[PDB]
Design a binder for this molecule. Structure first.
Ligand SMILES: Nc1nc2c(ncn2[C@@H]2O[C@H](COP(=O)(O)OP(=O)(O)NP(=O)(O)O)[C@@H](O)[C@H]2O)c(=O)[nH]1
Ligand SMILES: [Mg+2]
Ligand code: NI
Ligand code: NI
Length: 182
């Protein structure tokens, strides 16, 4: 059983590690040789927030949109988005703004967004300083975390954080809504 089913979509440039974040979170698995994502995939994991069972339904799709535009169907019903860039590849961070516009175009206007700087294990190749991404996240009302799907750092935390924020929002909406029914 679960108390909540939260659809959370992974978005971000191809190669940033979205599928490995998914595999790490849902299966504790990581693949150095993962290929670009076929179509759309989702995987689930349930976590407890405030003693409630939150079932995360995490969606994943290839980041490259040149030939294949992500439709609103991908974003539809999503209450969270993990907007992932690769800390070692500045272009993926530069594209965060385009991903934010994609969210505006395709997703619920109140979608919870977490900026995720993935591949923190590549600190020797870091192209995006943490405080820069933080400042950007703060400016854009995004939560922010750096992860490494490879070494697992902050992967649990990233998902738990976004899911908790979503939980906080919908649990409060439920209380309000119940009152409307009363
Ligand atoms: N060093 C390091 N490599 C990572 C990390 N996460 C993913 N990678 C590597 O980055 C490459 C792309 O990962 P992948 O998860 O497939 O990226 P993606 O964002 O899903 N790509 P696509 O959008 O095209 O499906 C793979 O070689 C993968 O092993 C990480 O945290 N650290
Ligand atoms: Mg992928
Ligand atoms: Ni679009
Ligand atoms: Ni109602």
């Amino acid at each position: 059983m679960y108390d909540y089913l939260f659809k959370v979509v992974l978005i971000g440039d191809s190669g940033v590690g979205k599928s490995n974040l998914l595999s790490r979170f849902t299966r504790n698995e990581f693949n150095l040789e993962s290929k670009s994502t076929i179509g759309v995939e989702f995987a689930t994991r349930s976590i407890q927030v405030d003693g409630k069972t939150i079932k995360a339904q995490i969606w994943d799709t290839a980041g490259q949109e040149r030939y294949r535009r992500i439709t609103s169907a991908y974003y539809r019903g999503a209450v969270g988005a993990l907007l992932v860039y690769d800390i070692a590849k500045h272009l993926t961070y530069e594209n965060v703004e385009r991903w934010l516009k994609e969210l505006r175009d395709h997703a619920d206007s109140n979608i919870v967004i977490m900026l995720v700087g993935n591949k923190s294990d590549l600190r020797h190749l870091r192209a995006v300083p943490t405080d820069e991404a933080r400042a950007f996240a703060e400016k854009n009302n995004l939560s922010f975390i750096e992860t490494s799907a490879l070494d697992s750092t902050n992967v649990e935390e990233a998902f738990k954080n976004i899911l908790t924020e979503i939980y906080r929002i919908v649990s409060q909406k439920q209380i309000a809504d119940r009152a409307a029914h009363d």
